[model samples]
Target: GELAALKQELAALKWELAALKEELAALKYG
Candidate 1:
């Protein structure tokens, strides 16, 4: 299921971005 894996990767990337943003915000604000 290549398509399914791609979708999962997209979701994972979205989650990663959220986590990265949280980290970036912490560094910027704290």
Candidate 2:
């Protein structure tokens, strides 16, 4: 159960990071 939770967290973090990259690009351009 712990491993599954960590994996899920990692997955969510990866998606969050992808969105962050897009935000960073917007900030960089603006």
Candidate 3:
């Protein structure tokens, strides 16, 4: 269930480098 839920959102993303960069940036500071 967890894996499926994760993949659902994973596929929802655009998979761009800048997108992941921003995500991790916010994750580190957030």
Candidate 4:
């Protein structure tokens, strides 16, 4: 159970980075 939860947290962190980069680019260029 802890392993699965850790995996899920990693996935969410990845997704957050994906979205964060997009916003960062927009802020940089806009």
Worst window of 10 by summed lDDT in candidate 4? 11-20
Clashing pairs for model 1 are none
Model 4, 1-30: lDDT tens digits are 999999999999999999999999999999
Question: Judged by lDDT against the true structure, how good is candidate 3?
Answer: 0.85
Ranking by lDDT: 4, 2, 1, 3
For model 1 the local lDDT of residue 19 reads 99
lDDT (Cα atoms) of all candidates against the true structure: 0.99, 0.99, 0.85, 1.00
How large an RMSD does model 4 have? 1.1
After superposition, candidate 3 runs with Cα above 4 Å error: 1-15
Residue runs of model 1 more than 4 Å from their true location after superposition: none
Q: Candidate 1 or 3, higher lDDT? A: 1
lDDT tens digits, residue span 1-30, model 3: 999999988776746766899999999999
State TM-scores per candidate: 0.69, 0.67, 0.48, 0.66
lDDT of 2 at 7: 100
Model 2 agreement with the true structure over 1-30: per-residue lDDT tens digits: 999999999999999999999999999999
- Write candidate 1's Cα lDDT for 1-30 as tens digits: 999999999999999999999999999999
